[PDB]
Structures are given as C-alpha cells and as structure tokens.
Design a protein around this ligand. Structure first.
Ligand SMILES: Nc1ncnc2c1ncn2[C@@H]1O[C@H](CSCC[C@H](N)C(=O)O)[C@@H](O)[C@H]1O
Length: 257
C-alpha cells in the first residue's frame, strides 16, 4: 500500500489536476464527479445548511473546489494536506501567483448553483480571503494537525483523501476518530468517499486506496462518535482507467455531545 513516503516523493499535483480536474470542457466522468461534489457541497453549506466560525479541510490536495460553497457560511477556513507539493499549489492559488491553477469553470458552476454564475470573481476572492492558513496534516495522528493545535472547530471537511491515506478499514475507522477530535461537541464532519476503490492513477503513477463499502463507512462514522445527519449517494464512477470505483457517498455527520 502506497504510504506517506510515496506521496512525499512521488505525488505530483500537476498530474493529479490533469487527471481529475482538467477543465477540458468535454462531457466526462471526472467532470461529473466534480459536479456531484459541488452539488452536495452547495446543499450542505448553502442557504439552510451548516454554518459556523471555523472549518478545517483535511487532505485538501492541490484543490480548492471543496470550499467554494463553504466560504459563505464559515469565515475561518484551514486547508491542510500531507503532501508538501500540494500545499505549495494551494499557496500559489491563494497568493494569485503566476503558476496558480485555473479553477474558473468550477467557481462558475458553484455560483450557478446559487442562482448567478456571473458573480464568480466575487466568490473566488471571498474563498481566498476566508482561507487563513495552509497546514501539514496526517490523519493517522491523534491530532492530525500536530504540532499545530487549533481550537476545536465547527466543521471538519474531507473529500477523496481518507481512502487514499488509510490502508485498511481499521485504519479508516481510527482516522475518523482522529478527525472527530478536531471538532467541538455538536460540530459536523462533511466527507465524500469513493466506494469499492482499490487504487487510482495520478498521471502515469498508481497509488493505493482502501476499498470500502458504504455500509462499512456508515458503521465507521457511527463508531467514531457521530450520528449521520445527511447522506447523499450517487452511482457515478470515474473512468475505470483512472479509478474503478463503485459510486460515491457524501456524508454529513454530527459529533454527539
Ligand atoms: N496520511 C494522510 N493524511 C492526510 N492526507 C493524506 C495522507 N496521505 C495522503 N493524503 C492526501 O490524500 C489526498 C488524496 S487526493 C484528494 C485531494 C482533494 N481533497 C480532492 O478533493 O480532490 C492527497 O492530497 C494526499 O496528499
């Protein structure tokens, strides 16, 4: 199973973005996966949804799409990733440096969900302003952000990373408890997990995944001290050449006080 050393040495954010977030304008399963997540996130963080002071995104990778809805409802956002190269990409985007990845199609889609795709620059800058820090994280640690110690948060967000970080169902179950430690009682975990996925491509390089069934994920969430508040499933899959998953599950879970 590809572990931390393999990520640190060999995970290339530019290859990751080209595989899963190409914005080539074509009809594609990768685009549909992004759309599904953007839809779930608008439901979760838009009008009538979750709101609070602090949100921590765990395993952000080099991507910012996952917090476009969130920045309307959480004023202090932390992004975090295990892989140094990924944190560098995030900082390029936040700083508006020349090498920053162009997320415009996703920003526009996020705004479209809110009823006006024309306000995309406003959303882009609102997110950028809301992101206060970019930190190392490791979900296997009791405190995933160690040696940083943040105040307990209103929300922990994590998309498509836990199943890459964890080699087994047991590792995944423990990692959920580690995320739960970052939350206030009554706080929420928001997570999207790909199902029955054993591996995924990042450009020409293969990385491992733990193959999880949604029943297992659901039990793991309950066992980590949460209840399930919302659950949104789709059969949507990536190209099987990239990642042969059996659909996808987005879960909003509340840490029981
Ligand atoms: N132990 C660990 N703790 C936290 N993140 C880890 C990790 N091991 C691997 N990762 C991260 O898991 C991510 C998987 S790719 C998912 C990226 C992004 N959240 C998206 O929505 O596309 C990578 O960014 C990788 O660095």
């Amino acid at each position: 199973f590809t572990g931390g050393d393999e990520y640190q040495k060999h995970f290339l954010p530019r290859d990751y973005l080209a595989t899963y977030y190409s914005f080539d304008g074509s009809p594609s399963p990768e685009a549909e996966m992004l759309k599904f997540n953007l839809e779930c996130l608008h439901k979760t963080f838009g009008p009538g949804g979750l709101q609070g002071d602090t949100l921590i995104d765990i395993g952000s990778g080099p991507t910012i799409y996952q917090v476009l809805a969130a920045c309307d409802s959480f004023q202090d956002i932390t992004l975090s990733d295990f892989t140094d190269r990924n944190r560098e990409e995030l900082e390029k985007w936040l700083k508006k440096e020349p090498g920053a990845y162009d997320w415009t199609p996703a920003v526009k889609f996020a705004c479209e969900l809110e009823g006006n795709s024309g306000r995309w620059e406003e959303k882009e800058e609102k997110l950028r302003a809301a992101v206060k820090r970019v930190l190392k994280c490791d979900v296997h640690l009791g405190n995933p952000l160690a040696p940083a110690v943040l105040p307990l948060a209103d929300c922990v967000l994590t998309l498509l990373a836990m199943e890459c970080a964890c080699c087994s169902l047991d590792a995944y179950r423990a990692a959920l408890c580690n995320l739960a430690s970052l939350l206030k009682p009554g706080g929420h975990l928001v997570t999207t997990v790909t199902l029955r996925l054993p591996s995924y491509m990042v450009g020409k390089r293969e990385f491992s995944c733990v193959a999880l069934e949604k029943g297992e994920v659901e039990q793991a969430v309950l066992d980590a001290g949460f209840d399930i508040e919302q659950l949104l499933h789709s059969p949507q899959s990536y190209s099987v050449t990239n990642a042969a998953n059996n659909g996808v599950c987005c879960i909003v879970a509340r840490k029981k006080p």
